[PDB]
Amino acid sequence: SFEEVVQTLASLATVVQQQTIASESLEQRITSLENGLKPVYDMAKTISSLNRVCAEMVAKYDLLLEHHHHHH
Amino acid sequence: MSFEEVVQTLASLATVVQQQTIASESLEQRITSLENGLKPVYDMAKTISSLNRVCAEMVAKYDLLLEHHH
Amino acid sequence: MSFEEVVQTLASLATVVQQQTIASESLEQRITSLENGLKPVYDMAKTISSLNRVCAEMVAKYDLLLEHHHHHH
Ligand SMILES: [Hg+2]
Ligand SMILES: [Hg+2]
Numbered sequence: 001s002f003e004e005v006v007q008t009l010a011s012l013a014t015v016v017q018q019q020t021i022a023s024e025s026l027e028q029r030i031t032s033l034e035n036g037l038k039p040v041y042d043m044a045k046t047i048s049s050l051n052r053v054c055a056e057m058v059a060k061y062d063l064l065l066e067h068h069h070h071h072h
Numbered sequence: 073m074s075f076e077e078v079v080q081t082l083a084s085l086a087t088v089v090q091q092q093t094i095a096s097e098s099l100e101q102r103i104t105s106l107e108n109g110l111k112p113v114y115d116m117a118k119t120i121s122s123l124n125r126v127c128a129e130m131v132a133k134y135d136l137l138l139e140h141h142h
Numbered sequence: 143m144s145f146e147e148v149v150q151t152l153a154s155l156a157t158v159v160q161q162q163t164i165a166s167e168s169l170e171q172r173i174t175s176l177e178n179g180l181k182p183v184y185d186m187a188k189t190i191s192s193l194n195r196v197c198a199e200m201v202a203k204y205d206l207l208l209e210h211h212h213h214h215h
């Protein structure tokens with residue numbers, strides 16, 4: 001009947017609306033992760049400071065290692 | 073378009089709504105799984121608050137043991 | 143609703159669903175980008191766990207050298 005055409009086109013329109021809202025709601029979370037990932041690209045500067053401290057700590061053993069060379 | 077074409081076209085869209093309902097739920101699973109990869113990040117981020125305490129307690133210990141020596 | 147009003151609402155729902163396809167197909171590209179992109183980001187997280195373990199291990203073992211200096215200097 002025609003009331004089937006009316007009832008169905010209502011429900012379908014409501015579900016088409018729910019996709020549009022949920023897609024933009026999903027799309028906010030995609031933009032979020034994209035933006036959340038950006039600062040990790042600047043990790044380079046921190047790893048360089050880690051590289052200082054990794055060598056600065058080893059340099060503390062300079063005199064102890066000098067003794068090793070003679071007495072081993 | 074006659075009344076036969078509306079019954080056909082109203083069903084023809086209902087297929088594509090069903091299709092993009094599943095495609096939306098596909099992309100849902102892919103995102104929700106990517107979000108589950110933050111399990112180590114929340115475990116990692118909490119511990120570093122406990123480990124500023126220990127270094128301040130270390131450095132203050134260092135400052136006093138140079139004061140008592142000098 | 144009239145019969146011309148159904149085919150208005152149906153032609154209007156036809157044009158938004160085809161734009162909903164352009165969005166879902168565009169969003170899938172930015173997800174597949176994040177799928178590859180977040181791998182090395184989450185992999186670096188596992189290494190920074192190691193780093194914060196190792197630094198705490200230094201603080202502890204350095205505290206032994208401090209409590210040596212207390213009982214020997
Ligand atoms: Hg460096
Ligand atoms: Hg190093």
Ligand SMILES: [Hg+2]
Nearest residue numbers: 124127128131
């Ligand atoms: Hg500190």
Ligand SMILES: [Hg+2]
Nearest residue numbers: 123194197198
């Ligand atoms: Hg630490």
